[PDB]
Ligand binder design. Structure first.
Ligand SMILES: [Zn+2]
Length: 632
RNA sequence: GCGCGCGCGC
RNA sequence: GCGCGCGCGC
């Protein structure tokens, strides 16, 4: 359960060796518990390995909050018995606390890295040598300009700067090292090297002496990809779609601020992109108007479901779902709006059924799926099969379809001890796994996995992924054969070259250009404000002042409010024209003042003296006379 | 908002 | 580079 006493498995003992022997290691092991337990061991040996009058300090880096939390607990619980001081710091703690002190008085610190990057940048923590051990969760992210790398740039600057200063052991954990954009083993192997260089790892630990034991707590099924296709012509999706347009235009006219309700533009019926757009519009409207909408949208949703049922199951099943829903409102409480929609449907109802019964509108997708089930079960009749589909709706359709089938009468299906096939949308020891048009992709011997998609891209993407997993396995298998001394030297060339381009590629101060400039909405090219009215908060954030602007923009209220540096996210802000409605940035309370904060990418820079129109995506890029903030 | 990573098109 | 998305962090 991850939260108690455990017997380490041989394979984890093996994985830890190189860490325990003191080398900087990358630990490539498959997903889950594995890594946690392993990083518990290392950590336990690290702080134990010390002689009296000496203490270790371990820091553990984690990318997501959920991970920062689940790992703060595990570490706390586990090292509780032992007497060590354990904490974490994340975005939500970090606000106003003596970060040097928290480290100073702690044996295990859990962090999200952007904290450390921030605190080394300030000088509040002068050096990494305070730490004895660094652990990088999901360490394959150590590249490019990621926090992990910023940390290492600091470390490698201390290491190669020829400066002492001791430095910590560095460990990274991963299920999968990556291969970047490599096209063959040669390049993959270059990629993994540069990766090791960045972590100053001299060893990559994987499981070798304990394969029989790993390959049984982590299948690893047989991967089968199987292309299909939808029907030749779907004249049913034409009917329901026309009904959706119809009911959308009916909601538009009762609402008219409709499109503005969400910036989820270019929506397409019968896509889950649409199902969200629905929800975002229903939560958004902040009420006789809002109650009219809930009803119209509650109808478009079932319509949307319906299409998704048609496309992956059969029309008979889409229709049924719809007859059901409509039945359920003819059965009270009934009002004009609802009786309207029910009528506009009742009108197609006859035609929908002709298209439904039409022999040439069966779903070729289902015959394939069928084949697969007859193929696999004739091999083994005691097979227990699991079926993943996209929507809770499609779950029933597929169940009904199977029950209502003479070609596969042999199944006993179930859903969300006697049953022998299970259908589902979310959540093992089953022996047959089928991802049917599942979108998707997320998550003892002889086991098979089938993906079935009409999409080529997916099938082709997934096959590229399999070729990379081999490319990756082989490379590792072979750099594992290099003698460490040789490997450490290859790494050092890399570290060196990489260090050099960091300093070289830096650039002097940028000479600021006094000339006043217009900011123009990037979309409609209407005037927004002037750079004269712009001010800079905390060196990083930009506001305008004065009311000439207080009405150049409109403010729909944010659906994701948060606080950062200081100050609260309250609203998104938008170009005030009715057909432009470009996204301008946001509007916050800061200290005492509600103020707008704007992103330059939402604008064109036109010099007034000349008319020249430059475009920036980052304020760091845009060099003008920036002025800090206060009374006004 | 800022920062970081990833994908799609051109 | 521009356009349009996703996920993540401060
Ligand atoms: Zn505009």
């Amino acid at each position: 359960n991850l939260y108690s006493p455990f017997k380490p498995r041989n394979y984890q003992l093996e994985l830890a060796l190189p860490a325990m022997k003191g080398k900087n290691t990358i630990i490539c092991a498959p997903t889950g518990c594995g890594k946690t337990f392993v990083s518990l061991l290392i950590c336990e040996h690290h702080l134990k390995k010390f002689p009296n009058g000496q203490k270790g300090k371990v820091v553990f880096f984690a990318n997501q909050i959920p991970v920062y939390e689940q790992n703060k607990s595990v570490f706390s619980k586990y090292f509780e018995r032992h007497g060590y001081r354990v904490t974490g710091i994340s975005g939500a703690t970090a606000e106003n606390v003596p970060v040097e002190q928290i480290v100073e008085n702690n044996d295990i610190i859990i962090l999200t890295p952007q904290i450390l990057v921030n605190n080394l940048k300030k000088g509040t923590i002068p050096s990494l040598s305070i730490f004895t051990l660094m652990i990088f969760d999901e360490c394959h992210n150590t590249s490019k300009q990621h926090p992990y790398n910023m940390i290492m740039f600091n470390y490698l600057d201390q290491k190669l700067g020829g400066s002492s200063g001791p430095l910590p052991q560095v460990i990274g954990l991963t299920a999968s090292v990556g291969v970047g954009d490599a096209k063959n083993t040669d390049e993959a192997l270059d990629y993994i090297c540069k990766l090791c260089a960045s972590l100053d790892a001299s060893v990559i630990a994987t499981v070798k002496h304990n394969l029989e034991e790993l390959e049984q707590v982590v299948y690893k099924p047989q991967k089968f990809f199987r292309k299909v296709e939808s029907r030749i012509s779907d004249k049913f999706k034409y009917i329901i779609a026309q009904l959706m347009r119809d009911t959308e235009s009916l909601a538009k006219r009762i609402c008219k601020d409709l499109e503005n309700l969400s910036q989820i533009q270019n929506r397409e019926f019968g896509t889950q992109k649409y199902e969200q757009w629905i929800v975002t519009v229903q939560k958004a409207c902040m009420s006789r108007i809002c109650k009219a909408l809930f009803l119209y949208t509650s109808h478009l949703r079932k319509y949307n479901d319906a299409l998704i049922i048609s496309e992956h199951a059969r029309m008979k099943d889409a229709l049924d779902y719809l007859k059901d829903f409509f039945s359920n409102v003819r059965a009270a409480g009934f009002d004009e709006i609802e009786q309207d929609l029910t009528q506009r449907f009742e009108e197609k109802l006859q035609e929908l059924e002709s298209v439904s019964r039409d022999p040439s509108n069966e779903n070729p997708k289902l015959e394939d799926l069928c084949f697969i089930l007859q193929e696999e079960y004739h091999l083994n009749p005691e097979t227990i099969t699991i079926l993943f589909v996209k929507t809770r709706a499609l779950v029933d359709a597929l169940k009904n379809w199977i029950e209502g089938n003479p070609k596969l009468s042999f199944l006993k299906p179930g859903i969300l001890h006697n049953i022998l096939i299970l259908t589902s949308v979310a959540d093992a020891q089953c022996n047959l796994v089928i991802l049917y048009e599942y979108v998707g992709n997320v998550i003892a011997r002889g086991s098979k996995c089938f993906l079935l998609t009409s999409n080529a891209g997916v099938i082709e993407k997934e096959q590229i992924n399999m070729y990379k997993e081999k490319m990756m396995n082989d490379s590792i298998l072979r750099l594992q054969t290099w003698d460490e001394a040789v490997f450490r030297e290859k790494i050092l060339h890399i570290q060196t070259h990489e260090k050099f381009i960091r300093d070289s590629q830096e650039k002097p101060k940028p000479v600021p250009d006094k000339e006043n400039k217009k900011l123009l909405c990037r979309k409609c090219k209407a005037l927004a404000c002037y750079t004269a009215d712009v001010r800079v908060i905390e060196e990083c954030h930009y506001t305008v002042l004065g009311d000439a602007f207080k009405e150049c923009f409109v403010s729909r209220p944010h659906p994701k409010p948060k606080q950062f540096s200081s100050f609260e996210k309250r609203a998104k802000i938008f170009c005030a024209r009715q057909n432009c409605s470009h996204d301008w940035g946001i509007h916050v309370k800061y200290k005492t003042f509600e103020i707008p904060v704007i992103k330059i990418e939402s604008f064109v820079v036109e010099d007034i003296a000349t008319g020249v129109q430059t475009l920036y995506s980052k304020w760091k890029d845009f060099h003008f006379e920036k002025i800090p903030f206060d009374p006004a």
